[PDB]
Every structure is written in structure tokens, then in C-alpha cells.
Amino acid sequence: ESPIGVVVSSRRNGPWAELTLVLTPQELDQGKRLLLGELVRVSSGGKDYVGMVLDGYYEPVGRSDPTYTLALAHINQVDLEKEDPWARKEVNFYHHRIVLLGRVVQGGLFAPSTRL
Amino acid sequence: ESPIGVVVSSRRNGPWAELTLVLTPQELDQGKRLLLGELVRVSSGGKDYVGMVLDGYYEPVGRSDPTYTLALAHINQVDLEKEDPWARKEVNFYHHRIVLLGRVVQGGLFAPSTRL
Amino acid sequence: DFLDDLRLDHYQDLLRELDELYQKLKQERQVPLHGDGEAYPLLTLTVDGGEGRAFEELPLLSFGLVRVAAVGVKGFRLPSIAHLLPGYEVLRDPKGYLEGLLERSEESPAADALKTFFRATGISLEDLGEYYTKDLRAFMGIFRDVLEWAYLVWGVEKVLQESYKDYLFIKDGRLAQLGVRESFRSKLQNYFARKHLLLAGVTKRSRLLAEGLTSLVMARLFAEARGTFVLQVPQELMEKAYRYERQWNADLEGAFVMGRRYVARLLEDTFRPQEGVAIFDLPPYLGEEDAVKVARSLRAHRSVLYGGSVGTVVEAHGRASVARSIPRRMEEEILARFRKAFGEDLAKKLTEWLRLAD
Amino acid sequence: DFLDDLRLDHYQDLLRELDELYQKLKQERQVPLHGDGEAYPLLTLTVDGGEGRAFEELPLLSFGLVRVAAVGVKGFRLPSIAHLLPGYEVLRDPKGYLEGLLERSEESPAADALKTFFRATGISLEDLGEYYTKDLRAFMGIFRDVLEWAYLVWGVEKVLQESYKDYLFIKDGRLAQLGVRESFRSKLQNYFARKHLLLAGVTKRSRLLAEGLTSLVMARLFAEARGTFVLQVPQELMEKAYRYERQWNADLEGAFVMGRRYVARLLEDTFRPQEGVAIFDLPPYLGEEDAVKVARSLRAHRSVLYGGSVGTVVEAHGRASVARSIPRRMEEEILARFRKAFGEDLAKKLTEWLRLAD
């Protein structure tokens, strides 16, 4: 019943509204993932929308160097599962893109896309 | 029976999902290399994937200027191997890209690509 | 005249000491840092963010940036102190404001810690010297120090009580204190010795030229060495640096560590000559076995973030360095209080001049 | 933690004072920079990089970055001086190093300039005091000043001789010197009065550390005013500024200008409040008529490059601040002389000392 991640950006890409979601290190360790093409609920302004997952990628969050940190933790036999919680807590982020297909209103009517 | 390198990034590039890994100076000195078109095994979440080495390139790792360092090493003679061991350890990184083809599940069934 | 006429004098002799000083380090025994042994839980002390943007970006009035906190294990952290730092008008009598808080009938959480530190070890205002009364930024130079010292003493005698037998204390900085007047550190040494405390303040990376010629020799010992070890710095390296910082560093009257200095390497492979090293100092009443057990405790908490830091040190920074955009946040709040207070139109005049310059 | 009752006592007094400082500034008449008049030719003195890259990134030995030069009209510039400056080892006894250069039988042009300065006004080593003996940084603090002071005298009595009567001398920075006894200031002051030298310490430096609460009133007049004007700041503002700056920054004993401070405006439209302003000092033996003529000379050479600078100041900076990447040039050249000198292979070890770290 809790939200999946955190929304950090939104825009309109052509005829479709889209938003970017970020999964944090605390959520990923519990096994929370988003499949591609999966249907999710988007809550905004007290109103519910149907969204679909399109893209997923990895991007650094904040001012950090994931490559150097991971290489240094690799040349040493450092098991990031449980040896170094602090290093794992700044590099375990993931980004997803979600389109807003529309919404359900009245008694099952589908309002397509959105103007808001 | 050991990982070849360290995985530093992942994303979806079109209809396929690929990842980027780095070979460190320590492993490159042992002759560990990857061939283009080679088939490798990928372990993630307890599951095994078939990967194919697609591309390889060079990119600076950390705060360093490989061109300046190599140029000044060459200008002043300097046999970098037996004279400046620490100069190679900051420039001897290589990057490889691996696409995920699918998984082998059940008793020989092939599951193509991945949504995860 | 373009760089010509170098006329360099004898510098081979300068390298002669460097050669023989390295031989002394090689003579010193190295205790291997194996993974098996006993270790102490950590309680890292950190203030951070106190200096901030100095005054040229701060409003210069009610410049509240002092914020000292601590962290423990995975949630054993103590409540943070975020002392309200007043304006310059009340600081025109540097002794006046401190007495107004120490002698105040009601004690703030910051005032309680300062009061607690005063009667725990008998610290009097005559022991603080005159550096805090020298100038304005000089007052904040050692106000943070006593606040940092108070945060350690207050937690021991008020928050933790008797259980200080299984918690290693880590201080982010050098043990040595400046502006002592030979009494601030005398009362600190015997107070710690009587309680047999385990205060081992680490500096991890130190600085490029925080020391004199010792930083050069220390740098090359680490790179040519292999694996993990514990090394006690011989007094000869320390003796040279202590007398030098007067003629190279700032007004550093009082720089020798209150005890002994130990260095260690936390990572076998580093990609760089000086990565993975940790420098920490111990009180004089701690021996080799105490130092080895302390070094093993740091290795169990080691991390790979900047250069192989101590881990709990950087975690404590995130809990005590909440400054970010202080000048924008405080300026809007300051005008909010001045608008809702008396006048109700003097604030409009105040904005007219702040927006003009500075 | 958070705000937590930041508390206030009284701030109505601060702007009550600030209101009447601005009114006092309006009392004096704003003498405008009239388009017509007479102006002297200028001769600008610059050092621009005496400290430069300090010592941290420099090889720390033979860190000679002093480069004092000058410019006249467009091409009347005098030869520059690149005075030699050995490393920390040779000047380990700072008093001894100067004596070996002052009392040497053969004096370099850089040494002759310092020697002529000492002989012209009778400045002894006791007049310098004891600040440069405290630290290597402190040694460089006043060496850049005396070299600039000597270079000014070096051109008066050797290159100009009789011609020190139709040129206005512009010196970067304030007409003040810190770190020396009152004898240095008193002897220098009366020496200029005897020769009636024209001099102006143009600063234009809108720093917030120096010139504190005074700047919060200076900015009000500059922005509200119109056109080009020259104003004599009342001594009351300097009395506030001179005394207060002792209690904010480091050992700034001695900040009063040797005379009176004048502010001026070089541009009418500026896009910003503090753009186009210029602050210059004058010796006490020059009146308002001389002050007006000095401002006309500065305006006749004005430029729009950074904030409406003086033009000849920035022009001489390009001719006298040729540092760029000094450390790369110094390390390779110093090591070049090491090989041709004794050893020819100890430099290989010397590189190993530096290659690993610093």
C-alpha cells in the first residue's frame, strides 16, 4: 500500500505525458523491481491515472563516482552484500520512465491521455 | 570461477538490455581479455543469463587525464612499466558492453531477452 | 631574467636525511592486521558545517552554523546540538555573552553541554586563553572546539553514564588543542586518564602539507609497503614536524599530539600511492595492544568512498553537516521575524539596502 | 536541531545608526568630474603574484614568484625586476639571508633597488620589526611590499632623476603597510613630503572582509547617486572602519591611510550599483584641488573591462603577472640543473621522491 519509489521529473514527450521514477537503495534491497510493460497506478491531485513502464536505466544520484568506487571495491575482495553499507547506499539507485495512458472515470469510462 | 570484471552500468538499448563493465589495471596485467562476439554468463538475483560481448572502448576512470600523463611520460623517456608503476594504475582501464540474450530455464527451455 | 640564474645550493644533503629517515621507518616493526581478533564498537564524534560560508555570504547577524552531533553503530546516535549562534551586536563583549549563558538560570541543550563540561573537569574561563577574545572569526575558531569537547563529555556523564567500557570514541581531527594556555589540555589529560577512556581521534587523510617534511616520508612509506599493518610513527619524524609548524603553518602554538601517533593501511589495493591510509592518535596511557585492538576496530568499519575512509566518519558528517543553502534560508526567515515584530515597515527598508549590495 | 526559537534582543539600533551614516555622507558636496580640466600622465606600479601559487603546489624550494614591474603612457614602461628568491633551506635564518644580500659586495639590480631604497630613506632592519621572522608565509608577506616600495624609489632617483614632477604615481592597493614598526611608516611618510611626490593608492577592491559596516553605507550613496563625482569621505567613517577591522580579521595592526580617502565614479550608466566606482587615497599634504586633478587623471584613462577599472592598472597586470603554470616550468628546469651538477643520477631518486606524492 506504500509508494514504490520517488518521482523526480515529468514532462510531455509528444502526445503523451511521462514521468521519471527513482528506486532508492533501501527499496532495492527488499526486492522491489518494476517490470517493463507493467501497469501501475499514479496518484496526483487526488486523481488516479494508469501508467506503463517503458524504459529503465542507471544514473548517478548526487555528486558521486560509481565507476571508481565499484572498481576499488572490486580489486579488494569487498562483498558489497554485507561489508560496506555506506558505499552501497549511494550507488544503488535506478531510474524508470512511465507514460500516462489515461484514467478510469464514472462507471468504467476510460478518459484517454491527460491535459494536466 | 571468478568474475571477469566489475559491472558499472546497465540500461535498455531498444529491444534489448545491455550493461557496461570495466577491466581494471590489476586484471589487465594478468592477461584477462574479452573477445568480440564471445558468449559469457551473467549472474543476477540468483539467475543466469546468456550475454554477448558487443563493443569495447577506452574511457578515463576517476579524476585523471590519460592523454597528458602518457604524453609527458613519453616526452621524458620514462619506461612506464619498470619506472612509474603508479602511472599505469590510473590509466589502464578498459570498458566493455554486453547485451543480454536470455536465460536457460527448466530442462533446456530458452526464455528470450528479459523484462527485468 | 626569465627564470635564469637558478644558482641552486647544496640539496644532496637535504635528500640525505630523507634517505636515512626512510631507513628508520623500515626498522620499526609492523604488526600485521589479520581479520581475526577482538574489536570495540564505534561512537564517532563530528561537528562539521560550523565554518560554512564565513561571514561574507552569511547575513553576519545571528550566524547560526555550529551544529555538533554523533553517530553510533546503526542507530545508537545521540541527540544533536544545534546551538543558536547570536549576532555580532551581543558578541562585542566576547566574555560577556559566555557568562550570560553559563550563569543563566535556564540552560539550553547547548548551554547544558557547555555547563556539563565545565564542572565535569573544572574548566574555568581563565583556562581558555585570549584567542576567543582576539577577533571575531577567532572567537568561532575555538568556540567549536570547546563545543566539540563538551559534546563528548556531556554524553559520557549524562547520556551514557557507567557503560563507557565497550565504546571506542572516534574524534574527527587531531587530538592536540590550540589555545590551551597549558591548562585546557592538562585538565583534559588527567580527566581522561582517571576514567581510562578510549578516545582515539582519527584524521584518516590529514592534509598535503599539514605536517612539515614528515608528509613526504610518510607518503612514500605507504606506497612501497604492501598489505595491511599497524605502524607507530617514530618520535624523530614527529619531533621534526612539531617544531616546524611554527615556521611553516599558521599560529599553531601547541601542536604535539597528546600521546602517540599510529598509522595503518585499510586496503591492500588502492590504485594510488596514498589511498587507504589512516592516521590516529592515542592518549599516553595506551600501549601497543590497545593500539592494535583500536586499529582492528577501524578496519572492521572501513569503507571505500573517497580514499578508504573510516565509514562512520562520513556517516556522521551527513548527520551533522546540514548547511547547504543557509544564507538564503536564514535571510528569508530573519526578514520574516523582523516584519512580524515591531515596526512592520523597517523590514521593507532593510530589504532596500540588502538587495543593493552585500 | 532546527530553528528552535532563534531569539532576538534588539536590532532597531543597527539601522538607526546606518540611517544617519548615509545622511552624513549627503552632507558633503559631490564635486563632479568635470569634462574640462588638466590631467597628469600616469605611471602605474604592479607586482601581481608575489605569493602567486603559494608553496603547496610549487616545488617548495626556490619558490621565486616575485615580479615587480611598471608601465608608462603606452610604451614608457621601465625594465621589470624578477628578484631571486631561494628556498626555505637558504633562508632558514631569515635575518641572515637578507644580510647576505644587503651587505654583499656585488649587488644585483634587484638587490641594488633594495639597497638604494635603504640608502635613500635610511630604513634599517630594526624598522622592519619581527613579523617576517615568524614564518615562511610571513617572510613573503612584507618582502612583496618592500620590493614594491623599493621599486617605487628605484625609479624616482635613478630612471627619472629630475623628472618626478610631471607624472602621477598610481600604486595598486591601499596606502598602508602592516607588519612593520611605526618607524617604517613615519620615515617613509616624511620622505615623500620632502620630495612632494604625487602618489595615489588606488584600490577599487570591493572586498567585504576589509571595509565592513562602512561598505553597507558606502554602497547606498554609490547606487543612489548619478553621474560622475569625487567625494571626500568624512573621517568619522574611517574612524569606524579603522578601529573595527582590528577586531574582525588577523593581525591587521595599522590600516589608516597616510592621508585622506577619496571615492569617485568613472561611469554614468553601469547596469549594477557598485560598477564604475573607484577609491583612491592621497598623502595629507595635498588638498582638494589636487584631489580633483587626480580624479580627472584617473577618469581620462578609464576603461570598461571588469567593473569600470582604471585601465593602466589592468594593463600593467598583464605585463607583470606572467605566471600561468609556473610549477611545470620550475620542476623540469630545477631537475635539469640537478643532472648537469653533481651526481647526474641522484635526480632519478629525486624524481622518485616527488613522483610518488608531492
D264 and D279 in contact (C-beta within 8 Å)? yes
Tell me the backbone φ, ψ of residue C9, rounded to 5 degrees: -90, -165
CB–CB contact A55 B12 (8 Å): yes
Residue C213: CB atoms within 10 Å: 19
Residues of D in contact with C3 (CB under 8 A): 329-330, 333
CB–CB contact B86 C269 (8 Å): no
Q: What is the distance in angstroms between the Cα of C184 and the nearest Cα belonging to chain B?
A: 42
* Cβ-proximal residues to A30 (8 Å cutoff; 6+ apart), any chain: none
Residues of D in contact with C273 (CB under 8 A): 356-357
CB–CB contact A56 B12 (8 Å): yes
* Cβ-proximal residues to D140 (8 Å cutoff; 6+ apart), any chain: D50, D51
CB–CB contact B26 C269 (8 Å): yes
Task: Give B 50-69 residues with CB within 8 A of chain C.
Answer: 62
CB–CB contact B9 A66 (8 Å): yes
Strand (E) or helix (H) holding D32: strand D31-32
Chain pair B-C, CB pairs under 8 angstroms: 10
Residues of C in contact with B62 (CB under 8 A): 271
Cα D48 to Cα D76, D173, D303, D322, D326, distances in angstroms: 19, 11, 19, 9, 14
Chain pair B-D, CB pairs under 8 angstroms: 3
* Cβ-proximal residues to D69 (8 Å cutoff; 6+ apart), any chain: D46, D47, D77, D78, D80, D81, D316, D319, D320
The identity of residue A73, as a single letter, is A
B14: left (phi over 0), alpha (psi -120 to 50) or beta: left
Q: What is the distance in angstroms between the Cα of B108 and the nearest Cα belonging to chain A?
A: 24
D109 and C32 in contact (C-beta within 8 Å)? no
Task: Give A 25-44 residues with CB within 8 A of chain B.
Answer: 33, 35-38
Q: How far apart are CA C128 and CA C102, in angstroms?
A: 14
Q: Are there at least 3 beta-carbon pairs closer than 8 Å between C and B?
A: yes
Q: Is B72 exposed, middle or buried (0-12, 13-18, 19+ CB in 10 A)?
A: middle
What sign has the CA pseudo-torsion C304, C307, C311, C314? Answer: negative
Cα B73 to Cα C242, D7, D144, distances in angstroms: 37, 62, 36
Contact A105/C at CB under 8 A: no
Q: How far apart are CA A93 and CA A58, in angstroms?
A: 7
> Distance of alpha carbon A87 from its chain centroid, rounded?
20
**Resolution to one decimal, Å:** 2.8
Q: Partners for A (CB, 8 Å, 3+ pairs)?
A: B, C
Q: Partners for D (CB, 8 Å, 3+ pairs)?
A: B, C
Residues of C in contact with A87 (CB under 8 A): 303-305
What cell was used for D248?
574582525
Method: cryo-EM
